[PDB]
Amino acid sequence: LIYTAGGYFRQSLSYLEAYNPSDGTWLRLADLQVPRSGLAGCVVGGLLYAVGGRNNSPDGNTDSSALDCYNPMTNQWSPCAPMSVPRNRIGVGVIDGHIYAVGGSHGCIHHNSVERYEPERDEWHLVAPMLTRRIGVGVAVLNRLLYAVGGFDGTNRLNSAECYYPERNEWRMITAMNTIRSGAGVCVLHNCIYAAGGYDGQDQLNSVERYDVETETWTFVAPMKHRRSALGITVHQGRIYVLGGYDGHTFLDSVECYDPDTDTWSEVTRMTSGRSGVGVAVT
């Protein structure tokens, strides 16, 4: 199942819903303890983690440092130790069963900091900061290296990308993307890093490009049907799924699915309600 947690439509949301690509169904599961948008999702050891984000409510607006864990076998959330700082519009990635929290903002602060969570000790520790301040940063892991792609540094949107080596604890710039993108969906499919959609400061984007480590090169592939910023993305059974987002006018409920063998996108479902800034993962 494809799980989507949180998101934003007029205010931050609590929804946890899970899509079955065979059945077509959406399952309504336990609500997040706190409504959150701009968060990220990931899965370690079969548990689904919701990381960071921001609570936009009619009574307040607070960024979140929270880490929360959902168990599909109990349908229950339980909190985890929090990160050192709140991180709205975060990106995350998993290496060696550890969760890396990358970038994001806290108020006017635009993080370049990065921290690592270890589930078996419920502890966060800070690691080497990025070369760049990145909010709305896409994150993906390839061959146990951690890539941070695009984003917004507070003044400029970015097409640059950099790569973190866990065992040297350092970051190194890599080839930049063709397109400037903040709030894109970034994931690994087979052995290439995909960057889809986002916002360049002028338009929401439908273009998709992918990075090959062997040629250290970004190449465009088929674009999505719907331009969208702040979309969710994940990989299920060899295919990329992008969920919702914002196209400059509406918060989308469209879910598009990319097949790499045909290099084609199709709309496969609609979410129960349109939203942007979700966390998405598969377990």
CB neighbours of residue 57 within 10 Å: 11
The breaks in the chain (C to N more than 2.5 Å) occur after none
One-letter amino acid for residue 44 of the chain: V
Resolution in A: 2.2
Burial state string for 141-167 with b = 16 or more CB within 10 A and e = fewer than 16: bbeebbbbbbbbbeeebbbbbbbbebe
Closest by Cα among 73, 61, 64, 9 to 33 = 64
- Output the six-digit token pair for 31: 């609500």
Going 84 to 110 to 233 to 208, the CA torsion angle's sign is negative
Q: Hey, what amino acid is at 206?
A: N
Q: Which residues fall within 8 angstroms of residue 260, CB to CB, at 6 or more apart?
A: 189, 190, 238, 239, 240
Distance separating alpha carbons of residues 109 and 107, to the nearest angstrom: 5
CA angle 213, 89, 196 (to 5 degrees): 40
> Domain coordinates of the chain in residue numbers?
1-283
* Whether 221 contacts 263, CB under 8 Å: yes
Are 255 and 234 contacting, i.e. CB atoms less than 8 angstroms apart? no
CB–CB of 197/242 below 8 Å? Answer: yes
